[PDB]
Design a protein around this nucleic acid. Structure first.
Lengths: 116, 136, 178, 50, 113, 79
RNA sequence: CGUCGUAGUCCGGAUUGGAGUCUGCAACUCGACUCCAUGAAGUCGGAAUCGCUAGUAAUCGUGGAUCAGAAUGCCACGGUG
RNA sequence: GGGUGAUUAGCUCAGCUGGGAGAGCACCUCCCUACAAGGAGGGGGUCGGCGGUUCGAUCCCGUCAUCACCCACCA
RNA sequence: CGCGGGGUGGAGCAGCCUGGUAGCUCGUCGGGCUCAUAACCCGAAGGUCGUCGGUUCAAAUCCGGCCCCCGCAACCA
RNA sequence: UCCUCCUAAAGAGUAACGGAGGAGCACGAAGGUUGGCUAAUCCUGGUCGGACAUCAGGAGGUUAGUGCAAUGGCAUAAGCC
């Protein structure tokens, strides 16, 4: 199953983020929904989040899994992280390959509040 | 026959023989022979002790033995001026300490199990004890 | 594709209560058609095998390549990285295109057509379904009188039993056991 | 006695050489490698066994 | 062009891929060439333009392979399905014609290395 | 040759005890080639090519004593 | 007269096969005949070696006994020379 | 008891970047005449066995058999 | 950093210093000859020279390299 | 001379001409990095098909693997594409 293959692509990146500290952006996807959440340097708390499951984000879309839906989460999480003063961070991609929908989220954040 | 598969590490060293053994209650039959002393047994000595029991009961019982050798002995034909290397292996040995059960039987009466285990006592380094199933 | 959707539209789904299944997700499907070629131990001239691989690439939408053995120590006293076959396997749009000329007709060349066994076991419902020998297709530079050739046809399925594979196989031109 | 010891020279020109070993018994092909030197400050491929 | 064979004449006469096709022997393929208006003059290997059609109509008039012998799927039972000594020798590498085995034994059914 | 030449065992084991350090570096057990159980915390990494245990800090060590398998991590805390 | 220009050949025939025709107490086994289907080996041959006289040698034809049927064995008769 | 080596076709023996084993004799059929010598045609071995190492073992590793040698210990 | 020569059909060795032209002697094989085998005799088969470039109209033949293989000697940690 | 595991004692050092075995070099790659991938071996059916390698299915091992030996780490792969 793809989840059991995805953790095999994430455990080294996560063990190395455990050396870097600070907040993680936790960018995650499924074929129907896109997600991001700012989690603390200890994992005990989440500061702010964004996803294509939110009432107003989900209706202002043609499909909640599209590149435009990943960009909508990028603009939301960057606005919400800029409200919390977040800057000078790295990109955590939850075991996913960065091309396509994960990059469309990263470019939407660029002029919205977050650059890597 | 009465040796483990060969290894490149066959020149095993003597340890230090000590007390306590976990295996003490019969598990193959209703009558058995227990060490109640400490020492060592050779791969020919255990078969000579089995043969004395075999000749006492013949067909009237099957014999079990909990013992198969775990170390060789390194040995040389005569004393030497010291010295070089470590000698070659010549015979195999098993270690015994007091709580250990050694042999078991079931198909015989108790008075014949006592006789068969008496007929081996002069081939052994320790003064053994008779064991029964003893269930309430 | 000419014929393809039929194999998930109604195939076995019309009979799934003979198996007391309730969801169409409990019903078998085809995954792929593997193919395997008889290599004839050839090594010293090896160009007739490259031309038989060009005739395998004439019936498969794949690039012709080589397969390895899994063992590097074996009772066959094998060498390292040993080339053992070719596959040239069909899935999706290339499998539905292969169904237009293969596994559908063999009578344009005959001698008896009643002989040969037509059996398989797997316990999970995967099959060996080839009916043997070729009719040869009209092409160019194909007058080489090439000898000792074989192509074995196996199917991979989503089935859960030996009889579910035998029920799915009915959707193809296969003669079955007497 | 089975390997050669060669003198490779910079594609930017050097009186000096880069010192390394090479095959002489089963490979006729050449050895070429990028290296730095503070007289040209460019990091350049060293080539041909002089 | 392919009408009955699987082979092509390169330097040999026009009887190649018209003879030995499992239905037409050396005497009958000669008669088919004459019936198609083809002559043996200058040892032809490549036919004239459209001349294959006049030849095709004659070789498709003869029976081949599974039509030359068209009941072998039924004639098999008296040979392989019941007890048959005429078959049992064949499946032991032996003939059934009254063979002088002290002369003809050769290699194909047992060496002779 | 061939000959049984045995070789020498060379140091390893411990260098000191309790919460050590306070000058420039946190030098742990001097056990070479070891990557099984004794490690530095990700928050304060060190170690060299040979995996000999140390952590990059001028203060005093603390032990985390918990983690995966048998991991206990040489760590730092401000006093 | 027609034809190949030297090709494993329009060469070559053993085998694997079909369907009919005849005799006979009876032909699966251990026969002949016919018309057809597949068509290998063989490219003039180890150490070497046989024969010869004038209508003869050479070579191509014809007949007959053994039979109900059945020889490349057996015995005989012409052309050309 | 301990140690160094030899064992490859019916015979004597070559054969280690180990990789699917070979010649000369001999023998069969023959030539010559009924044989010898020898010319021509032709076959191949658990590489003494067992059990391992190895991509591959006749060869390396531990052992048993068959065969030869080294030793009863310096004063 | 120092040393002379060879590689020619299957061996052996000429030919190379004459640029244009392949040789001697064995072996291998076909015939011829005989009471065996063979020997001998008369013929035949195998050749742009280890190999890659350069000089030139033209390279076995003149020059530079790489590999196989064998002598000799000065400085050489 | 050097080196992996052990004698060696809940620091080191260390016995003896002690037990099992390596190094004196090789690959400009097995170095640097991005991303992907997942490993003994066994059984059964189907075949080319000479037990078993293969094609697919079922079972099970991070005991597979690493330029070299040893020992431990390791799929988070430092293992191979």
């Amino acid at each position: 199953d793809k989840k059991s293959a995805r953790i095999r692509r994430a455990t080294r990146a996560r063990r190395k983020l455990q050396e870097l500290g600070a907040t993680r952006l936790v960018v995650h996807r499924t074929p129907r929904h896109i997600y991001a959440q700012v989690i603390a340097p200890n994992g005990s708390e989440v500061l702010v989040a964004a996803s294509t499951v939110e009432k107003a984000i989900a209706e202002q879309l043609k499909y909640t899994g599209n590149k435009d839906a990943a960009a909508a989460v990028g603009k939301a999480v960057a606005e919400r992280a800029l409200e919390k003063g977040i800057k000078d961070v790295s990109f955590d991609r939850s075991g996913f390959q960065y091309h396509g929908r994960v990059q469309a989220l990263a470019d939407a954040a660029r002029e919205a509040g977050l650059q890597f | 026959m009465l040796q483990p598969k060969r290894t490149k590490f066959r020149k095993m060293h003597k340890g230090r023989n000590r007390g306590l053994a976990q295996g003490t209650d019969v598990s193959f039959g209703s009558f058995g022979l227990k060490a109640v002393g400490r020492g060592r047994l050779t791969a020919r000595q255990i078969e000579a002790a089995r043969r004395a029991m075999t000749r006492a009961v013949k067909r009237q019982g099957k014999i079990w033995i909990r013992v198969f050798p775990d170390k060789p002995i390194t040995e040389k034909p005569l004393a030497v001026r010291m010295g070089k290397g470590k000698g070659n292996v010549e015979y195999w040995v098993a270690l015994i300490q007091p709580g250990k059960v050694l042999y078991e039987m079931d198909g015989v009466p108790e008075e014949l199990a006592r006789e068969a285990f008496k007929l081996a006592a002069a081939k052994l380094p320790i003064k053994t004890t008779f064991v029964t199933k003893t269930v309430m | 594709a000419k014929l393809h959707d039929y194999y998930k539209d109604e195939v076995v789904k019309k009979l799934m209560t003979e198996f007391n299944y309730n969801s169409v997700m409990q019903v078998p499907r085809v995954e792929k058609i593997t193919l395997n070629m008889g290599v004839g131990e050839a090594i010293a001239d090896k160009k007739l095998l490259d031309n038989a691989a060009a005739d395998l690439a004439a019936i498969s939408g794949q690039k012709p390549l080589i397969t390895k053995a899994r063992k590097s120590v074996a009772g066959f006293k094998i060498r390292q990285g040993y080339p053992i076959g070719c596959k040239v396997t069909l899935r999706g749009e290339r499998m539905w295109e292969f169904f237009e000329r293969l596994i559908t007709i063999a009578v344009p060349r005959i001698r008896d057509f009643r002989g040969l066994s037509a059996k398989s076991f797997d316990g999970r419902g995967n099959y060996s379904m080839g009916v043997r020998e070729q009719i040869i297709f009209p092409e160019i530079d194909y007058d080489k009188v090439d000898r000792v050739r074989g192509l074995d046809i196996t199917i991979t399925t989503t089935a859960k039993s030996d009889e579910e594979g035998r029920a799915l196989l009915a959707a193809f031109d296969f003669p079955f056991r007497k | 006695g089975i390997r050669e010891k060669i003198k490779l020279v910079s594609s930017a020109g050097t009186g000096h050489f880069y010192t390394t070993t090479k095959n002489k018994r089963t490979k006729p092909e050449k050895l070429e490698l990028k290296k730095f030197d503070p007289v040209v400050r460019q990091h350049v491929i060293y080539k041909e066994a002089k | 062009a392919r009408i009955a064979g699987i082979n092509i004449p390169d330097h040999k006469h026009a009887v190649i891929a018209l003879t030995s096709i499992y239905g037409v022997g050396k005497t009958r393929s000669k008669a088919i060439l004459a019936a198609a208006g083809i002559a043996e003059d200058v040892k032809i290997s490549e036919l004239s333009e459209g001349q294959i059609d006049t030849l095709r109509d004659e070789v498709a008039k003869f029976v081949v392979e599974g039509d030359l012998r068209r009941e072998i799927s039924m004639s098999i039972k008296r040979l392989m399905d019941l007890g048959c000594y005429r078959g049992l020798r064949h499946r032991r590498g032996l003939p059934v014609r009254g063979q002088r085995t002290k002369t003809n034994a050769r290699t194909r059914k047992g060496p002779r290395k | 040759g061939g000959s049984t030449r045995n070789g020498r065992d060379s140091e390893a084991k411990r260098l000191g005890v309790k919460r050590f350090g306070g000058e420039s570096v946190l030098a742990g057990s001097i056990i070479v080639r070891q990557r099984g159980t004794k490690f530095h915390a990700g928050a304060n990494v060190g170690c060299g090519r040979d995996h000999t245990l140390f952590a990059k800090a001028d203060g005093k060590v603390k032990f985390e004593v918990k983690g995966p398998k048998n991991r206990k991590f040489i760590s730092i805390e401000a006093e």
